[model samples]
Target: PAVPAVFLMKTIEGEDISIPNKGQKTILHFWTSWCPPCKKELPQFQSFYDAHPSDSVKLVTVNLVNSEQNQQVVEDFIKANKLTFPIVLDSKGELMKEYHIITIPTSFLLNEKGEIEKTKIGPMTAEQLKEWTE
Candidate 1:
């Protein structure tokens, strides 16, 4: 499925953005701190990113800010996990509602044209990510 035409978001770093730009694919991941699977999955995504080293794909992780853990705890978790991926905040729950993201650790793999090529609703391994992007 293609994303909504009006799909746009402002990053926590204060930049307005849209997806599937410059003919690059993207991984739009939605997760929460309380989701146990997210703990293992994020590190795998980071490993995959390190190995790929390609600008052809982009990764954006949106945190459900209202989750059980406080913002400080989330920050600590991010620092401890050493994830360098672009982490965005779904601060007002707007992204969650717009994306229909009910479950945690859900990922949408978008094609170069911004169409959703696949959707994985669980933890993803580096191998799976590589295969999908390739």
Candidate 2:
């Protein structure tokens, strides 16, 4: 199925962002600042983001703000980790509910058409990230 449309979400930098990135494949991830597995998997994501060009495969991680203490906590976590990939804030859990996310580190691999090509419920390794995106 095609991923649901996202509206009014903003990156940590306060830039407006949306999904189904249209012409590019996307790694749509849901995570919270305090989730251990989410933290564990982020470095792999960072590595992947650093290596891949945005015009091809994009990484769009969603921070589940409702599961967090505050926006400051999310900001601090991102800064502390030195992550440069685009991360959108799910302030009201809207995307969470839309994506039907029940786990902290779930991920979806969407094709250029925004259709789900793969889904994962736990942390992804660097090798798996490469294989899945390929």
Candidate 3:
């Protein structure tokens, strides 16, 4: 089954966005700024995002906001790391409930059709990200 479509989410920049964007494969990653694994894997994800074209592949990160100190902390982390990929705030934990997320840094690889191709429960490497998209 396809993952639930996202309509109520907003990017860190307060821009409206959706997952599995039509015609583009999407990497939907769930993370928290304080998670050690999330911090480690984010850079790898960013590298992959930078290498791929937005029309071909998209990286959308979801911050587990309920677990964070505040929005400012999340923003600070992103700014400090210089991450350029789009990030969405899961303010109400709606995504966590919908996706049955049980771990930090969980990720879903969605195809152009919006169906999940794979799910990872932990941090992923740059090579793994490349291999998955291929």
Candidate 4:
């Protein structure tokens, strides 16, 4: 299957999470706060997230907090940036390796069918993302 079969993810608060199994494109982002490039685009995505209703396109951020970073830093970043979307914590870096993520800010634009439609390896503008998701 192009989409993984119901992989379990936990929020930063430890609650279980899953992708929207419906007709909504998911902009899945993998990033770490330690990276400058990641820092640049995060707010853009946050703005994009705030613009749309929750059912249209879901913005999921996979914070790589396991990579020698502290929980407080991650928590503080979220608070400081006012990121309103759901955050999925990669506590053990398993998801990193599973996705073969060698870059800090990679994004997968999964269509409503949950298949990867596009991939971006660097910073993406809010306008660009809005056009793609819409």
Can you rank all candidates by TM-score, best first? 2, 3, 1, 4
> If scored against the real structure, what TM-score would every candidate get?
0.83, 0.87, 0.87, 0.83
lDDT of 2 by residue, 1-134 (tens): 32456454567867666676757787888888789999888998888777773457777889988788988888898998898888998877678877789887998988876678999999997677777767
- Clash pairs, candidate 2, are none
Better candidate by TM-score, 3 or 4? 3
Cα error, residue 3 of model 1, in Å, equals 7.0
Most accurate candidate by lDDT: 3
Q: Candidate 2 at 121: error in angstroms? A: 0.5
lDDT (0 to 1) per candidate: 0.76, 0.80, 0.82, 0.76
Clashes of each: 0, 0, 0, 0
- Where in model 1 is the C-alpha error above 4 Å? 1-3, 6-17
lDDT of 1: 0.76
- Compared with the true structure, what per-residue lDDT tens digits does model 4 show for residues 1-134? 23364446777656666653356677788988879998888888888777874466777779888873688888998888787767887787766766678897898877766677888899998898887765
Q: What would the per-residue lDDT of candidate 1 be over residues 1-134, giving only the tens digit for each residue? A: 32465346766546665665456788888887668999778888889878975567777778887884677777777777777777777778766886788788899888767777899998999888887777
Alpha-carbon shift of residue 98 in model 2 (angstroms)? 1.0
Residue 2 error, candidate 1, Å? 10
| Residue 8, candidate 2: alpha-carbon lDDT | 48
